[PDB]
Amino acid sequence: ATRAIPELTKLLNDEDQVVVNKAAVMVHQLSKKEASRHAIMRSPQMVSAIVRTMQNTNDVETARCTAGTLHNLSHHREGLLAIFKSGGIPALVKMLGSPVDSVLFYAITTLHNLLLHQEGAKMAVRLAGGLQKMVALLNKTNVKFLAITTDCLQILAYGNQESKLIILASGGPQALVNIMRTYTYEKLLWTTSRVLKVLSVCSSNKPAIVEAGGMQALGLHLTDPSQRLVQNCLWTLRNLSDAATKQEGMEGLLGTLVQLLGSDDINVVTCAAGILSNLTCNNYKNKMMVCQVGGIEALVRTVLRAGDREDITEPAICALRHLTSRHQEAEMAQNAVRLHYGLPVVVKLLHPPSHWPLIKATVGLIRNLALCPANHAPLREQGAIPRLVQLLVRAHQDTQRRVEGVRMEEIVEGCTGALHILARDVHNRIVIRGLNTIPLFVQLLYSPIENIQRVAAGVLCELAQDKEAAEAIEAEGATAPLTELLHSRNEGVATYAAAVLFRMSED
């Protein structure tokens, strides 16, 4: 056991075909005896000998045995410091090009233990070019092996933009996405989804993950019994979903997200809402699918249940706003919000304690709801108009005498746009006018921002259809600013402006 030792050193470090080969099969043996090995990491001349013969050999049993030893040695915090102080990291990495499975398994786990416990190991693996080597190993098929390799990658990539970009350039995204859609082994899907989460916050990795089919592959695991796997999939999907507008094959993912809205899990709900929010922006087919699988219903229930938790209601409200315009079933969806009892909660979200991003999204949603005639009356009855007017008046003041992510100019435009639509209904025009808004709408004709001039002249165009209001609009001196706006580069602006003028000068 203890005394007769650096014998096998000298024959290992030898320059002969048989000599070092059969000598290595020896340290191998003795490293297995737990308390016998805990003494063999002592010899710097011994430790480093192991390393060399591994780096340059031919023997599949030399290799196996050298690696397995380092493997075996990598369990004590003294056992690791030895491998490290010796410099096996670069050789171990070099062993990641080997074609012999057992050699792979031994290298990876040694690096793994080193990456896990040993000071300074992350930096030395990077220097050795391990990232590239680990990425190329992702095409293997042994799940235990792949689990370890993906975990090395997560350890290296976390908080290290340089490493994330090397992973990108080595084709990481595709190979990690392949893993997600091929395997079922939880431990492996989990660590892989962690690697994808870490990369999904990277400006360059994100579209590559999306181009590789990331969104669909991640979707596959959203009903796994493993909660840590589903959640990590939800976080990654969320980070990526603003880049996935152009993706097809999205129908399964979209249906699962709708079901996930009903979850008891707050992070689950929060994620699904935000993912549905992003994937529905502009892509009218996603709109179509989400509505076809009951999205409106589910989004209304989610908003009713969230109460004042803005992490939920804001993305849910943005999703409902996407879903209530500019697709073939926009109109059924505008109706469905009312039918599932959404109109009161949506008006309620305009009031404190709601913060600005929510108010903004909510106003946008009201705008859309108002395109549907049968919403005109309940919106009024729920009190939509006076709050939208107060929000407008206050936000316009803030813009003159000059917030939390949002510019008051957006609330001005949003509120005026919402009132423009609501003004289609005659009783609504009475409330709007009775709130003495005409002076304000006229001032908004002078705004620098064209979209504001558009909704302002549009709402005046709606109001000017009643005799009494046209007179009022004229008394505000609207003729002059409308005169100049006839020449706006914006056709909406120039057209609305001419309809007001027409309706005023029937005298």
What would the DSSP string read from start to end of 134-161? HHHGGG---HHHHHHHHHHHHHHHTT-H
Breaks (C-N over 2.5 A) in the chain follow: 402
210 token code pair: 């999306």
On whether the CB atoms of residues 165 and 201 are closer than 8 A, the answer is: no
Neighbours of 42 (CB within 10 A): 12
Query: How large is the angle between the packed helices 450-463 and 467-475, nearest 10 degrees?
Result: 140
Q: Are the C-beta atoms of 230 and 275 separated by less than 8 Å?
A: no
CB 291 within 8 A of CB 332: yes
- Rounded Cα distance, 214 and 487, in Å: 48
* CB neighbour class for 480 (10 Å; exposed up to 12, middle 13-18, buried from 19): exposed
Contact 43, 5 (CB under 8 A): yes
Cβ distance 115 to 128 under 8 Å? no
Q: CB neighbours of 96 closer than 8 A, spacing ≥ 6?
A: 104, 107, 108, 130, 133, 134, 136, 137
Give the integer Cα–Cα distance in Å for 237 and 222.
10
Dist CA 437 CA 390 (whole Å): 10
Q: Is the peptide bond before 353 cis (omega within 30 degrees of 0)?
A: yes
For 293-355, where are the alpha helices, taking DSSP H only?
295-306, 310-323, 330-339, 343-348
For helices 373-381 and 408-422, angle between their N-to-C axes, nearest 10 degrees: 120
Sign, Cα dihedral of 79, 83, 89, 93: negative
Token pair 């609330």 is at which residue?
Answer: 411
Determine contact, residues 449/429, Cβ cutoff 8 Å: no
Chain centre to alpha carbon of residue 475: 52
To which residue do tokens 């919106």 refer? Answer: 379
Q: Decide: helix, strand or coil at residue 378.
A: helix
Q: In the numeric block, which tokens belong to residue 79?
A: 């056992």
DSSP state of 87: T
Core vs surface per residue 266-286: b (16+ CB within 10 A) or e: eebbbbbbbbbbbbbbebeeb
Determine the Cα–Cα distance for residues 223 and 304; give it in Å rounded to an integer: 24
- Please tell me the experimental approach by which this structure was elucidated: X-ray
CA angle in degrees (0–180, nearest 5) for 109-113-115: 110
Structure tokens at 301: 């229930």
Which residues are within 8 A (CB) of 462 and not within 5 positions of it... i.e. 6 or more apart? 420, 423, 424, 429
Token pair listed for 24:
């290595």
- Three state DSSP letters for 271-301: HHHHHHHHHHCCCHHHHHHHHHCCHHHHHHH
User: What three-state secondary structure class fits 197?
Assistant: helix
Which tokens sit at 199? 């990369």
Cβ neighbours of residue 464 closer than 8 Å, sequence gap 6 or more:
470, 473, 499, 500, 503, 504
Contacts of 279 (CB under 8 A, 6+ apart): 241, 244, 245, 247, 250, 254, 286
Site of tokens 């009190």: 383
Residue corresponding to tokens 């108010």: 359
Other CB atoms within 10 A of residue 127 CB? 11
Chain-centroid distance, C-alpha 398: 33
- DSSP calls for 388-401: HHHHHHHHHHHHH-
Round to whole Å and give the CA distance between 459 and 438.
9
Rounded CA gap, 343 and 348, in Å?
Answer: 9
93 and 125 Cβ atoms separated by less than 8 Å: yes
Handedness of CA 403, 405, 410, 414 (dihedral sign): negative
| 3-state helix, strand and coil shares in percent for the chain, rounded to the nearest 5 | 75, 0, 25
CA distances from 315 to 261, 302, 362, 495 (A): 12, 10, 10, 34
Q: At what angle do helices 44-55 and 77-86 cross, to 10 degrees?
A: 60
- Tokens, residue 361: 């999204």
Rounded to the nearest 10 degrees, the angle between the axes of helix 408-422 and helix 384-400 is 150
* Token pair for 331: 């109109």
Write out the two tokens for 74: 């990598």
The two structure tokens encoding residue 211: 């181009």
Determine whether 177 is exposed, middle or buried from the number of CB atoms within 10 Å of its CB (0-12, 13-18, 19+). buried
Report the C-alpha gap between 261 and 267 in whole angstroms.
10
How large is the greatest C-alpha to C-alpha distance in the chain, in angstroms?
A: 118
**∠ at Cα 228 (185, 212), nearest 5°?**
65
Measure the CA–CA gap between 205 and 168, rounded to whole angstroms.
6
173 neighbors 206 (Cβ within 8 angstroms): no
What amino acid is encoded at 343 in this protein? L
Structure tokens at 431: 């409330």
Q: What is the DSSP letter of 354?
A: -
Cβ(291)–Cβ(333) under 8 Å?
Answer: yes
SS3 249: coil
Measure the CA–CA gap between 111 and 93, rounded to whole angstroms: 8
Q: How far apart are CA 263 and CA 265, in angstroms?
A: 5
Query: Crossing angle, helix 356-369 and helix 330-339, to 10 degrees?
Result: 110
Sign of CA dihedral 205, 210, 212, 215: positive
- DSSP code of 367? H
Are 312 and 270 in contact by the 8 Å Cβ rule? The answer is yes
Q: What is the distance between the alpha carbons of residues 242 and 254, in angstroms, rounded to a whole number?
A: 14
Q: For residue 165, which phi and psi values (nearest 5 degrees)?
A: -75, -35
What's the token pair of residue 444? 């908004």
Which amino acid is present at 398?
D
Q: What is the Cα Rg of the chain in Å?
A: 33
Nominal resolution in Å? Answer: 2.2
Query: Cβ distance 427 to 380 under 8 Å?
Result: yes
Structure tokens at 505: 């000068």
- The residue with tokens 């040694």 is 110
Distances (CA, A) of 2 to 35, 50, 166: 10, 20, 46
Task: Give CA–CA dist 226/282, Å, rounded.
Answer: 33
What values do phi and psi take at 367, rounded to 5? -35, -55
Q: How far is CA 206 from CA 30, 174, 203, in A?
A: 48, 11, 6
